[PDB]
Short mmCIF file of C-alpha atoms and ligand atoms in Angstrom, two decimals:
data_model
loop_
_atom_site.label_atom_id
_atom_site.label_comp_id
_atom_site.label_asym_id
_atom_site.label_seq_id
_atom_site.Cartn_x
_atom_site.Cartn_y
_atom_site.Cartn_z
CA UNK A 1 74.91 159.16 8.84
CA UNK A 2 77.07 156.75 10.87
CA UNK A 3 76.50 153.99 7.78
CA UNK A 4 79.69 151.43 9.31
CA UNK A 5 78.04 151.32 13.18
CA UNK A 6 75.70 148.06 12.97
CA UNK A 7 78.58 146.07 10.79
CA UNK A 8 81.27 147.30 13.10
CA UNK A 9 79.20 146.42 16.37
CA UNK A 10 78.46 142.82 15.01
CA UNK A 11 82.52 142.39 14.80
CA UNK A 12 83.16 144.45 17.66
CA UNK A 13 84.72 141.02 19.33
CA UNK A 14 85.68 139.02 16.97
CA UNK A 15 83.57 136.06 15.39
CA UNK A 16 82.35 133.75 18.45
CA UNK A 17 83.34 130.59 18.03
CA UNK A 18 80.67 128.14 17.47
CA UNK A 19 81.31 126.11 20.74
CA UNK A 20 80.09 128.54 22.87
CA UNK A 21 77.22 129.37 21.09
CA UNK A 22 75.35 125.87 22.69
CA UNK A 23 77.29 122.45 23.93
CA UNK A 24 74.38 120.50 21.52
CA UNK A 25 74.76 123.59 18.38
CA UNK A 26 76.21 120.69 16.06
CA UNK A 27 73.70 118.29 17.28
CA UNK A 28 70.40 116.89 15.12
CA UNK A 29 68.64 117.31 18.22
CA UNK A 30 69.49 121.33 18.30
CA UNK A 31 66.33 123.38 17.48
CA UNK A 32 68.05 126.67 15.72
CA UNK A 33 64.50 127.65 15.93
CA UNK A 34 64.86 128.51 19.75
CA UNK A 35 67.75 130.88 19.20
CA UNK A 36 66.76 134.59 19.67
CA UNK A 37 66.53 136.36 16.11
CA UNK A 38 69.44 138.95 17.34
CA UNK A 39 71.86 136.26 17.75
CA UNK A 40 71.29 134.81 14.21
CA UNK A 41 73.90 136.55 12.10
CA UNK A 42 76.56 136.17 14.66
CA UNK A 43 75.68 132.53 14.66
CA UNK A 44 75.78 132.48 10.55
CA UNK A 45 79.36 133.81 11.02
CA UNK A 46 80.32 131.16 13.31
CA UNK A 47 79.16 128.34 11.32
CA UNK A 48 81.15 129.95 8.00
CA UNK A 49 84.15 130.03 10.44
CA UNK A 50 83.99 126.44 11.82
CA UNK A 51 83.19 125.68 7.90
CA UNK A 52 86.53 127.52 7.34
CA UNK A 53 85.21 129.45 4.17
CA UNK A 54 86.38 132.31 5.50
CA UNK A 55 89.63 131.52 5.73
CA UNK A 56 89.76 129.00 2.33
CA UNK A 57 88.41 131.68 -0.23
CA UNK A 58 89.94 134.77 1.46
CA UNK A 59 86.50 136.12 2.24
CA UNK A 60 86.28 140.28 3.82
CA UNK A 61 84.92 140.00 7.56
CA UNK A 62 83.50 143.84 7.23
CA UNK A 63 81.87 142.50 3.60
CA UNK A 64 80.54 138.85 4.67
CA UNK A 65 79.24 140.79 7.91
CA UNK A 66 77.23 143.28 5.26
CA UNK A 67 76.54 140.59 3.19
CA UNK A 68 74.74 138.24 6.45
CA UNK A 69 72.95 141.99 7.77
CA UNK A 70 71.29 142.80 3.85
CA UNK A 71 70.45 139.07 3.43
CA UNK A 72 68.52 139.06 7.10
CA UNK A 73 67.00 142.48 6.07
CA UNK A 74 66.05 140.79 2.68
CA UNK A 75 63.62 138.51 3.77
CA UNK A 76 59.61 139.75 4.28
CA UNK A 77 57.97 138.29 7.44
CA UNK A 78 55.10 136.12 6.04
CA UNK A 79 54.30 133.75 8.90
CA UNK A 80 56.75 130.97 7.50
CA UNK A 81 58.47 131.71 4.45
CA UNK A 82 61.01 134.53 6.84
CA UNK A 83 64.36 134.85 7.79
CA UNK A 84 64.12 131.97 11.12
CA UNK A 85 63.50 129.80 8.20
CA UNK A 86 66.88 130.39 6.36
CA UNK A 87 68.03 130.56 9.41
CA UNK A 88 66.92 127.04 10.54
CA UNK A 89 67.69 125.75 6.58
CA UNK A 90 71.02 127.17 6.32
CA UNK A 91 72.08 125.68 10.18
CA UNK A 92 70.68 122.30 8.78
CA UNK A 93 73.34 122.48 6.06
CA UNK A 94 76.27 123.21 8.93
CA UNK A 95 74.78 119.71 10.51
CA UNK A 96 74.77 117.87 7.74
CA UNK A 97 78.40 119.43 7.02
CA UNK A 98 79.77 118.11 10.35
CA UNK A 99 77.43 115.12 10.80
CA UNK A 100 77.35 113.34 7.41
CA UNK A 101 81.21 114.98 6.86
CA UNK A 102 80.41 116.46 3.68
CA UNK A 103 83.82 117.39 2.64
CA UNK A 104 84.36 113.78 1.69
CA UNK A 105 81.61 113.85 -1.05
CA UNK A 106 81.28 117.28 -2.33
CA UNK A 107 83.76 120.02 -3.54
CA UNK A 108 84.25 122.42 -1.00
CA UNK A 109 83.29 125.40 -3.34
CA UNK A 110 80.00 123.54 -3.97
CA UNK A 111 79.55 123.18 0.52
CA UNK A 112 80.34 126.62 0.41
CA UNK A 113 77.18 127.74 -2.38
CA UNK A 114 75.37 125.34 -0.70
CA UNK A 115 74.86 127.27 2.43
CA UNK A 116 75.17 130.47 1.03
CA UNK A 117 71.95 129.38 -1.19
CA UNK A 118 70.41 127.83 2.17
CA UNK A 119 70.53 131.68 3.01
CA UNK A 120 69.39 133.38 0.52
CA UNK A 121 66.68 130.69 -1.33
CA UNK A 122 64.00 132.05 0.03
CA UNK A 123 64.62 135.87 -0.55
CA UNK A 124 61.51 138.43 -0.95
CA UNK A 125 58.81 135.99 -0.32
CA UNK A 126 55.46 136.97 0.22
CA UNK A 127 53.53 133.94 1.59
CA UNK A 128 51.89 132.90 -1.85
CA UNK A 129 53.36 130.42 -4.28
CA UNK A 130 54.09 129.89 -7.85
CA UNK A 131 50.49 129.06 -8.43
CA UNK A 132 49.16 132.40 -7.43
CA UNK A 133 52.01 134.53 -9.23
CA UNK A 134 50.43 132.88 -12.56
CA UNK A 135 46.84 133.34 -11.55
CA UNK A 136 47.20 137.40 -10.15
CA UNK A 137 49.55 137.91 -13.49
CA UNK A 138 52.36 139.04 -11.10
CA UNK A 139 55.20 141.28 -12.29
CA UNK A 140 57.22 138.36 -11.33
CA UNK A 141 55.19 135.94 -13.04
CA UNK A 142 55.65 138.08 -16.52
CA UNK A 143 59.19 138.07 -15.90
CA UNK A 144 59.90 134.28 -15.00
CA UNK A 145 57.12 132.36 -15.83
CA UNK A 146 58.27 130.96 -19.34
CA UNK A 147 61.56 129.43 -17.55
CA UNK A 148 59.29 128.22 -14.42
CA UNK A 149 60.06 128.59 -10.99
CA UNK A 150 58.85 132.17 -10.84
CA UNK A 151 59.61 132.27 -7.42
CA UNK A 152 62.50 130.34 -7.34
CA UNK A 153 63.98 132.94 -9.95
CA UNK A 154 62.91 135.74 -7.76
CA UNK A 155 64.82 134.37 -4.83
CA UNK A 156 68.09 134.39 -7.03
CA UNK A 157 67.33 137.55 -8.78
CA UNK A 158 67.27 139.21 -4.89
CA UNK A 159 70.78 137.30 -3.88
CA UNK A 160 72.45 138.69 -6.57
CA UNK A 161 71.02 142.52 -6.10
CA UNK A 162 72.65 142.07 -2.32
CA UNK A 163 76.18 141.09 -3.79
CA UNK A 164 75.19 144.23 -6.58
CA UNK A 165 74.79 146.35 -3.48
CA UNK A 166 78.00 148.26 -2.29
CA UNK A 167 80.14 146.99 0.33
CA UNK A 168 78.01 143.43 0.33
CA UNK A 169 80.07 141.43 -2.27
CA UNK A 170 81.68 138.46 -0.75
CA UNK A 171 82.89 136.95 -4.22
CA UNK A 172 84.23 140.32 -5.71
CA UNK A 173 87.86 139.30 -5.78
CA UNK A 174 86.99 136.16 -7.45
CA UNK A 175 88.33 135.45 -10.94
CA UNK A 176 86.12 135.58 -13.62
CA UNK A 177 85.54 132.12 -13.25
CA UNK A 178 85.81 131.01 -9.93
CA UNK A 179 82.75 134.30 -9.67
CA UNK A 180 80.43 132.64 -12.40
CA UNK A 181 80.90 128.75 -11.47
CA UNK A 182 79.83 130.57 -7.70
CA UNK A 183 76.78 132.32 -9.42
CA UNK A 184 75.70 129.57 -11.26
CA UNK A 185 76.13 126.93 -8.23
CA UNK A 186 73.67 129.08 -6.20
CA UNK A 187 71.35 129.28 -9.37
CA UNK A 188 70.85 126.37 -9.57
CA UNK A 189 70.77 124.70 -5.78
CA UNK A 190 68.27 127.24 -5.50
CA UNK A 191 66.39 126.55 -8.81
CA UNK A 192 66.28 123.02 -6.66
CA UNK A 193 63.97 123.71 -3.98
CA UNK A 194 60.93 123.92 -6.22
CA UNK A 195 58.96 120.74 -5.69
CA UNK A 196 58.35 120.18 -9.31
CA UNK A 197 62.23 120.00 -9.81
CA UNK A 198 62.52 117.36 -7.35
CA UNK A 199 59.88 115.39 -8.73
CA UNK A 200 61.64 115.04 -12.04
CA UNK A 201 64.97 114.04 -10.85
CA UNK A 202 63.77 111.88 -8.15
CA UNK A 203 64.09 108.60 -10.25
CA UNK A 204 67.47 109.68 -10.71
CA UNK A 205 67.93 110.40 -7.39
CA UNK A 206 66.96 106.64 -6.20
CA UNK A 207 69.26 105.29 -9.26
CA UNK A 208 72.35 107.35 -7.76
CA UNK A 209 71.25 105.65 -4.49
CA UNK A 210 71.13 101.93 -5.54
CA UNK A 211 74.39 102.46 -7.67
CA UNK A 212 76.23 104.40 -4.96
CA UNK A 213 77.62 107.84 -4.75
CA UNK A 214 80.90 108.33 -6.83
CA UNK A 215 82.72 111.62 -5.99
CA UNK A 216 84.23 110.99 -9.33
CA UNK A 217 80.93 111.33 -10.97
CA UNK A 218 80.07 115.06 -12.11
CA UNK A 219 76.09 114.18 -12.33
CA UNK A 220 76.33 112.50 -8.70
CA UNK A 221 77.33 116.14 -7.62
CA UNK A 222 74.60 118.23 -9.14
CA UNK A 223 72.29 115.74 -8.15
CA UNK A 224 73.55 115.40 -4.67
CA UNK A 225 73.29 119.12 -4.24
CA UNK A 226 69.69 118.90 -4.57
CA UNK A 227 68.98 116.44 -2.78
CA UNK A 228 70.57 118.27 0.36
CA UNK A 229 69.12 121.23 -0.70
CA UNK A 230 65.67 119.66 -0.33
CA UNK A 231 66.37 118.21 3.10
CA UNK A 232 67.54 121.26 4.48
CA UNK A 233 64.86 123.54 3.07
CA UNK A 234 62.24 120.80 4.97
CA UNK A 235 64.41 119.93 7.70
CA UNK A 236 61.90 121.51 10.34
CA UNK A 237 60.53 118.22 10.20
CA UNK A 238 63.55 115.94 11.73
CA UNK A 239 62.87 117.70 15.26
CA UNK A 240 60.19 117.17 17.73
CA UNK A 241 56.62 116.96 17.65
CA UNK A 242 56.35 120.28 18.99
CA UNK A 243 58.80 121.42 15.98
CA UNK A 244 56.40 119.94 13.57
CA UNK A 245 53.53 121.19 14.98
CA UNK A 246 54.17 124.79 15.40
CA UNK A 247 55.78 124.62 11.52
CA UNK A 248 52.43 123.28 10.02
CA UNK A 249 50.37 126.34 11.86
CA UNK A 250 52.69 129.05 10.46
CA UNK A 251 52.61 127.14 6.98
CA UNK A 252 48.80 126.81 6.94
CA UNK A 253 48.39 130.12 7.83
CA UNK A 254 49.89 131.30 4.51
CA UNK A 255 48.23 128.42 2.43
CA UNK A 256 44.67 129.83 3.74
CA UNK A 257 45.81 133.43 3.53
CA UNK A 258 46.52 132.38 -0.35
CA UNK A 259 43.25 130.63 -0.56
CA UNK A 260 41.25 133.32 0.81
CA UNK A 261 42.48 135.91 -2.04
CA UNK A 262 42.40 133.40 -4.64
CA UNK A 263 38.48 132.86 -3.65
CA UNK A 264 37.97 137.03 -3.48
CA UNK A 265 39.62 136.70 -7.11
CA UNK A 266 36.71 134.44 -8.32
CA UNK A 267 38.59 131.53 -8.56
CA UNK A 268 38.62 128.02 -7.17
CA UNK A 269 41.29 127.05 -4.23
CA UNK A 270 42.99 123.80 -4.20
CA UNK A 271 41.25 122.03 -1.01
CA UNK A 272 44.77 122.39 0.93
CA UNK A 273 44.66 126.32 0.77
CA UNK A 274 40.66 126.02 1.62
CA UNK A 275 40.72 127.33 5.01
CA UNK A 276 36.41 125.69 4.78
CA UNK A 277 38.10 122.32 3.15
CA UNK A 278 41.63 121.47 4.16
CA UNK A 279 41.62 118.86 7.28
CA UNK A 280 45.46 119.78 8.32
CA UNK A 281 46.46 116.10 10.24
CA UNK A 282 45.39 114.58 6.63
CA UNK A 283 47.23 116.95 4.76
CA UNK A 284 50.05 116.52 6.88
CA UNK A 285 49.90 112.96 6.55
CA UNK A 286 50.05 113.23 3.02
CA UNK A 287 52.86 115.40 2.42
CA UNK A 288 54.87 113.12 5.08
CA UNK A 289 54.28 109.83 2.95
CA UNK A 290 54.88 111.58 -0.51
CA UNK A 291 57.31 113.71 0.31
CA UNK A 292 59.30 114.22 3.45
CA UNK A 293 59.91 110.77 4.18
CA UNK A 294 61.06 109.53 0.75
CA UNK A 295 63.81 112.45 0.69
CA UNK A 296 65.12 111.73 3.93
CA UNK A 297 64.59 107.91 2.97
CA UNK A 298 66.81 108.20 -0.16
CA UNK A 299 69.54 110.46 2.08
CA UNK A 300 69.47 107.38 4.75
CA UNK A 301 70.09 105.18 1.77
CA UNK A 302 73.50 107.30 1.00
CA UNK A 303 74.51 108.37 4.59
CA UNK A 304 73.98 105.46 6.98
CA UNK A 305 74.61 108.54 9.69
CA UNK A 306 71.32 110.01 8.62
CA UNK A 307 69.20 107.02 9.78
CA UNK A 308 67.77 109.04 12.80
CA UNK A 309 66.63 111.85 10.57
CA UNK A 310 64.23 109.26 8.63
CA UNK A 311 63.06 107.70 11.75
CA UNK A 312 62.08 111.13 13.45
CA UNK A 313 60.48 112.17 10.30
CA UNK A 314 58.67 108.82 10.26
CA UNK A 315 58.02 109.33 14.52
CA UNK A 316 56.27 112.52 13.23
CA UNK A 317 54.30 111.11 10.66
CA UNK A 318 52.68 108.47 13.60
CA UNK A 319 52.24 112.03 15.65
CA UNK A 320 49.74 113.13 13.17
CA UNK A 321 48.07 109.65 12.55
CA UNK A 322 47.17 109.79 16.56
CA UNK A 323 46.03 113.45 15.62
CA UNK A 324 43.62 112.91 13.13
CA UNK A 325 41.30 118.26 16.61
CA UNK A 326 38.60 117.54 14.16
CA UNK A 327 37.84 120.83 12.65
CA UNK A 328 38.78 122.20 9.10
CA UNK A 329 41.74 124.78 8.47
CA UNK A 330 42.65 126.70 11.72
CA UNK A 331 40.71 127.24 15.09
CA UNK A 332 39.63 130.97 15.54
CA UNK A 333 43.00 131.59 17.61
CA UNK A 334 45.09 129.86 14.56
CA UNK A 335 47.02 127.92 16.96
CA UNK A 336 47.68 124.14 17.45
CA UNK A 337 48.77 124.47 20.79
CA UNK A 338 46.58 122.29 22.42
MG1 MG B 401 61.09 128.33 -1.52
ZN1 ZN B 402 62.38 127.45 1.96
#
């Protein structure tokens, strides 16, 4: 019955400053990835500190400390699509904070939704896509599927059933409508990391580009947000090889897992969720040419600072060229280690 022990032993000293959490923590060569799981929402806490939203929007430290614990428990543990993947997307957002020095571009209410929805935009998932919610005539598809972005929805649907939950709402003493320009900030950045989204604004994307960003300019915001959105949620791809690597096994691993049900169902797979089909190097090659590299091309194009983010993603994209060993899908061990 002791309900306040885990919060109260996460605070027991205070919020550790995020200095001596790692000398290279603020660094584009950190890996969050290589920080043990049990040291995550401490580490969330520090980067909100060294953010300062704490402090600037009078947020509870017994609430926000909830709020990190639910949002940690609220994530499934699919092979990629788990809570080490907020993790890494959310301390992406913190780099790009103190790296590209967001605070002289966006508001610092939309920073702070930004990172909240880098936490919570991948809520509930189960390692299958939109695709297959459609197709399996999901509850979730019923529910969302004539807005789109079933899963997207679901994600926000789950974020705001945490703040719902008691003691877990950060935003509670929020007026009216500071609390709804919050809710619908994290709607929509999270509404942003489906694909098909970025697709469609993408031409508007390279126009804000070629123009130049105006802080003045209410469009340049929302479409900003995305944008960052985007590169955090596929920010696994700016590290090393070995980064890349190990992300494409875990990712594959739920594509195939996908395919294989959709095949039992007596449908088709696309050839990239064929586990008998899908050549991973040329896959990867693909969705490096198409899509990684033009995001973090455009984000070069607006934050001279993020040059070596395109040129590792670009590094990574030659890794898999000298890669394509031969096999389809996944050896027997479903490992790329070698
Ligand atoms: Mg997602
Ligand atoms: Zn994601």
């Amino acid at each position: 019955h002791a309900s306040d022990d885990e919060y109260t032993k996460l605070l027991h000293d205070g919020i550790q400053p995020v200095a001596a959490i790692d000398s290279n923590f603020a660094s584009f060569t950190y890996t969050p990835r290589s920080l043990p799981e049990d040291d995550t929402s401490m580490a969330i806490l520090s980067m909100l500190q060294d953010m300062n939203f704490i402090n600037n929007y009078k947020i509870d430290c017994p609430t926000l400390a909830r709020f990190c614990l639910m949002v940690k428990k609220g994530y499934r543990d699919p092979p990629y699509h788990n809570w080490m993947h907020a993790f890494s997307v959310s301390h992406f957002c913190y780099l790009l904070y103190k790296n590209l020095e967001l605070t002289n571009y966006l508001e610092d209410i939309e920073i702070f939704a930004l990172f909240i929805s880098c936490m919570c935009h991948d809520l509930d998932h189960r390692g299958t896509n939109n695709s297959f919610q459609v197709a399996s005539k999901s509850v979730l598809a019923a529910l969302y599927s004539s807005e789109g972005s079933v899963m997207e929805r679901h994600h926000f649907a789950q974020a705001i059933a945490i703040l719902n939950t008691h003691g877990c709402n950060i935003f509670d003493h929020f007026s009216r409508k500071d609390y709804q320009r919050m809710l619908d900030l994290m709607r929509d950045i999270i509404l942003a990391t489906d694909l098909a989204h970025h697709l469609r604004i993408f031409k508007d994307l390279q126009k804000m580009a070629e123009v130049g960003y105006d802080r003045n300019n209410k469009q340049h915001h929302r479409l900003l947000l995305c944008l960052l959105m985007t590169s955090c949620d596929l920010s696994d791809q700016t590290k090393g090889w070995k980064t890349t690597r190990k992300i494409a096994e875990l990712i594959y691993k739920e594509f195939f897992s996908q395919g294989d049900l959709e095949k039992a169902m007596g449908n088709r797979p696309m050839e990239m969720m064929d586990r008998e089909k899908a050549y991973i190097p040329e896959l990867q090659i693909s969705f490096m040419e198409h899509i990684a590299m033009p995001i973090y091309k455009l984000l070069q194009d607006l934050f001279p600072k993020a040059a070596e983010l395109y040129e590792r993603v670009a590094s990574n994209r030659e890794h898999w060229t000298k890669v394509s060993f031969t096999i389809r899908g996944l050896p027997s061990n479903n490992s790329l280690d070698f």
